[PDB]
Design a protein around this nucleic acid. Sequence first.
DNA 1: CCGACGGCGCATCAGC
DNA 2: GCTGATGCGC
DNA 3: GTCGG
Length: 324
Amino acid sequence: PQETLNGGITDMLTELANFEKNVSQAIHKYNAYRKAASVIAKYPHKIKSGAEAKKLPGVGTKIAEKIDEFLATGKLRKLEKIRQDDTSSSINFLTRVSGIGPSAARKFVDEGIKTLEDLRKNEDKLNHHQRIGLKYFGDFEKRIPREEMLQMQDIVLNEVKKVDSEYIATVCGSFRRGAESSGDMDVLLTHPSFTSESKLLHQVVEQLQKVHFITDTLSKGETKFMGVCQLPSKNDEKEYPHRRIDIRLIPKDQYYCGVLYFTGSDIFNKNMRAHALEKGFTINEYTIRPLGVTGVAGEPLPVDSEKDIFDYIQWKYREPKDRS
DNA sequence: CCGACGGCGCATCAGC
DNA sequence: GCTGATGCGC
DNA sequence: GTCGG
Ligand SMILES: *CC[C@H](OP(*)(=O)O)[C@H](O)COP(=O)(O)O
Ligand code: NA
Ligand code: NA
């Protein structure tokens, strides 16, 4: 539906969501306002009253009253007052830096650090993650066109197999669901030597650094890498933006459940878990397990493919691109 | 009325 | 030195 | 902030 339908309302609710998350530190209100923004963005009518919006799930009495104020006045006094508070504005802005959440933003503004320039002058007060978030502030806010994601996928899948031909790597997220653009690249990796019962990530990260694909590290442990990458451009050509890449090393016996989980969408996964439950199975990120007659989860079932999960619960396979 | 609302993996701090 | 809490991103 | 036991 065209943004001109309810765009005023959905912008107001997104602004309130960001305020609750970044300033109030109220993650459950942030999610309530996001959920309300999302249901209203999908609604194929121009909302005429709060009462009409209130019929939608995730819209209750308070968001109805805000919509009535916005429809009558073209504004919300609560937001006009928030926009006049320079301290709220600074806290909200600093959370755009990866590694700066609501706590760090408030600590920074309370010691007079409010701008990107203030952060650059005070690098000693930033952790490693926040320094890299600052270094790539603009690039990290750019979307990744699908054509670039295809090129990135080709480097990652090929370089992983050069480390060891037995690795399996799958790019998940929006990209796997067939999105025309992505926020980041989320790679799930496994190897038959790694199961839930017994250097693998380090060697893959090392290879991707050696061919100058991975440029920086935000965090790295035994099973999760978060960092920065860049497509190679030909000499004299315009450089590609730096991109966020995550790499998750999953036990082989949990791998396809992970692929299903990190592919989504969220609504799809929720509908799939519910369907499994009525069929007598419980699905989480790691496993599919049969439920006994009193609701006790049994042993994990063997899963050798994503399709194996859909077969257990007798659902027809939804292609990754038919899950949003 | 009032608790749930995802929760893991990593970096870093608090406390011992 | 260690354990456990918190902040953070996804 | 909304939902639901
Ligand atoms: C927007 C109305 C609020 O809904 P939530 O419980 O955040 C409250 O009813 C009043 O909040 P105020 O806008 O701070 O007065
Ligand atoms: Na509603
Ligand atoms: Na941030």
